[PDB]
Write a protein that binds this ligand. Sequence first.
Ligand SMILES: O=C1C(NCCNc2c3c(nc4cc(Cl)ccc24)CCCC3)=CC(=O)c2c(O)cccc21
Ligand SMILES: *[C@@H]1O[C@H](CO)[C@@H](O[C@@H]2O[C@H](CO)[C@@H](O)[C@H](O)[C@H]2NC(C)=O)[C@H](O)[C@H]1NC(C)=O
Ligand SMILES: *[C@@H]1O[C@H](CO)[C@@H](O)[C@H](O)[C@H]1NC(C)=O
Ligand SMILES: *[C@@H]1O[C@H](CO)[C@@H](O)[C@H](O)[C@H]1NC(C)=O
Length: 534
Amino acid sequence: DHSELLVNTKSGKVMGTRVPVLSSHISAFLGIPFAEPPVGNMRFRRPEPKKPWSGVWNASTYPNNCQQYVDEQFPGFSGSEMWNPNREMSEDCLYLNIWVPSPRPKSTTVMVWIYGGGFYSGSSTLDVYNGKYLAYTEEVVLVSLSYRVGAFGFLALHGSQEAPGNVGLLDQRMALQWVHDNIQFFGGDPKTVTIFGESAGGASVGMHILSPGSRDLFRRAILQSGSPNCPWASVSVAEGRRRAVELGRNLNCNLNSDEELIHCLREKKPQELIDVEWNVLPFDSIFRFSFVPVIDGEFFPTSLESMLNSGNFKKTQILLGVNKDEGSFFLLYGAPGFSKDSESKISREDFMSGVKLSVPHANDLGLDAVTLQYTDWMDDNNGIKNRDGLDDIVGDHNVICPLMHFVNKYTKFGNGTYLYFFNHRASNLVWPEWMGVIHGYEIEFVFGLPLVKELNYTAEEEALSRRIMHYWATFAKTGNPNEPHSQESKWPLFTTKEQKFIDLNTEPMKVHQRLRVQMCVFWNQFLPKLLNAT
Ligand SMILES: O=C1C(NCCNc2c3c(nc4cc(Cl)ccc24)CCCC3)=CC(=O)c2c(O)cccc21
Ligand SMILES: *[C@@H]1O[C@H](CO)[C@@H](O[C@@H]2O[C@H](CO)[C@@H](O)[C@H](O)[C@H]2NC(C)=O)[C@H](O)[C@H]1NC(C)=O
Ligand SMILES: *[C@@H]1O[C@H](CO)[C@@H](O)[C@H](O)[C@H]1NC(C)=O
Ligand SMILES: *[C@@H]1O[C@H](CO)[C@@H](O)[C@H](O)[C@H]1NC(C)=O
């Protein structure tokens, strides 16, 4: 038995399937197990490596998606539905997927995609994460992994080895171990693995850069609209403890010991956990999630900010950036006065309420500083300015400014930073105009969807996708997104002194400096000082 669709790995033999892509074909190996099913009494534990198997693992179909909350705010609307599980859910969900050029390469660049979803949702199997276009067009081996989300991935009772926290990040790490150990059999070079992801996936990428136990498993990294230091992406062990206890309380559990709490939570069916998980948040807010990574002293040896300041992280090249209207999604879903089928002009009063929801940690003085920094006092009742102002508050506070802080710290010690600002509003977007360039909507350009006629993008969008795909792949290959010696415009390196970045859109490249500095000085220096003093 020796064929293109048959691969022998250290865990055993695997059978792929041949897959059409833009008038050609490539191989796909879908649903490969990298870990033991984390079911029964393994619920909440560290993952275990998958036991090698006899025979041939059938990898022709997508695996199950992890157990997660399902978005029903817009039943049947494609814009929301493109993010929900398109496969059955199960706790048996630790699989990865691989798309390989045909003919099988010998030793080519590997890209491993880590999905977002606020650490409580996400799937490797979504249509927007289909690796075939990028594998095919850029001649890379494209992997996507999966990882436990919600309580299953992130319930944390520090001190306990039954539910220690961060096990979803350990799931990701185990897949990356598997790729390190086995991708060579698929034609990938384990020495040139780029990890990439968006949102919590981007945060996850930054987290593997920081964690000593993950760093050696990859060469380079791309972070899309997420940063490990984002306010939503981690909590203290005391806060983790609190939430787990509270989750127990919502389920009539026995709170007397870690063991009694865990035993009870292990008896529950998955949906029972998911039905009450949104009831454990400390504040009334938006852009905050229930079970997330914990600063535990192990996966993360000290606080994220101390790791960044001292240079305790992997030094390599990174390519990263943000979308123009990162806040709009979260306002739609979580804040009063924003709705899908209206222009969502906002009163002064739904503004003040938006602010309080957006910065739950802030005292009154704090809320006043935010309000002043984002209100045009010559025109304080323009419902549009208020809407846009809140959009910018959410985006700047939760995504952009944390990313800019990560960038400036990393770049001091790292070996090459490329920064972008994606500001192209897709011509076939189904969400309303007010939402602008939405969190998550660069992905489709990164995975090459606009090259598919039927999906109704313009030609200039096809070209923008090809250009982005080629920057990301060239970067994964070399640590630099620019082709040596081509005549195209050059994406310059981001340096501590000059802080250059480019826009990503259908217009001639333009280079700028100091991405939102005015607001990021407010969010990164002034406001935390205000809140620590008062
Ligand atoms: O991640 C979600 C979230 N996930 C389900 C929606 N999925 C979307 C995702 C992304 N962008 C979206 C953009 C829109 Cl407009 C609607 C849903 C989106 C990019 C990251 C992958 C997930 C739902 C939420 O209500 C939510 C909040 O209310 C607050 C923070 C985060 C989330
Ligand atoms: C990334 O790291 C490499 C070295 O590991 C840097 O290249 C070196 O540059 C130093 C200082 O100019 C020279 O003395 C060496 O000749 C170089 N070594 C090699 C192998 O080229 C490179 O500059 C770094 N890039 C950035 C942007 O920091
Ligand atoms: C592999 O199994 C899947 C699972 O339903 C099936 O759809 C497909 O026809 C099978 N192919 C092979 C080669 O076994
Ligand atoms: C492309 O456009 C047509 C015509 O307006 C529409 O019916 C179709 O649903 C579109 N296809 C997709 C995938 O959106």
